[PDB]
A = this chain, B = another copy of it.
Amino acid sequence: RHVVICGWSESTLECLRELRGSEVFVLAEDENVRKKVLRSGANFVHGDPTRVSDLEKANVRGARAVIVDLESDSETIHCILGIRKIDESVRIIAEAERYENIEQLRMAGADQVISPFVISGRLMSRSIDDGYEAMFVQDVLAEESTRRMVEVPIPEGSKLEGVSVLDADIHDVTGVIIIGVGRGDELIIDPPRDYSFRAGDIILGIGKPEEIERLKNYI
């Protein structure tokens, strides 16, 4: 299991640091950033993220995921197309710079487009009186936070398979606040007391390391 990162930016460096313990390959055109990348844990391949052969060297084939963040949206698209020539199944997460380009990146085969300025402009509009929402968002997204957001899979044969929210009583049982459940394409926020859990559902919750290790055991 391993992750490939295409491009080196403030976003990808923060990504790399949030992926401590994990084996990672960074592919980028600028040799300058080797020790930055090495010292930062991961492995470095010097090359062009838009060149199939350079993606192959970076071990795109068979990767857990590929994260793409090139200098411009047009470059990002070219790299995606490149990864798709190599591996039709590997998960691609691409960063979009401009709103008009999001669908272009998914069209090229990105499974997910993260738009930092969308998120940021939305937080700006929410911070006109106080910083509580941004505070929330920034914090639950950090693995090093005390209370953080986590995804927990309901495996096949869990005590919760076919069990409603009300009965699982997860918050009281575990302390983890359930914010959502991911099931195939969709996210159900605020699962109603009615909701029946299924194997393969992803439980999105917020809790201390303590409450999380607990939920896993309940689960």
Interface residues of A (CB under 8 A from B): 3, 9-19, 64-65, 67, 69, 91, 93, 95, 97-99, 111-112, 114-143, 147, 149, 151, 175, 177, 179-180, 182, 187, 189-190, 202, 204, 206-207
Contact = CB atoms under 8 A, between A and B. Distances in A.
A110 B119 CA distance: 19
B140 A114 contact: no
Q: Determine the main DSSP class of A at the interface with B.
A: mixed
A23 B49 CA distance: 44
A111 B133 contact: no
Nearest to A67: B124
Given A139-B187, A179-B136, A128 B93 contact: yes
A180 B131 CA distance: 12
Among A64, A112, A132, chain B packs the most CB atoms within 10 A around the CB of A132
Given A16-B125, A65-B129, A177-B190, 9 more contacts: A14-B121, A17-B121, A91-B128, A119-B138, A132-B187, A132-B202, A133-B141, A135-B187, A136-B180
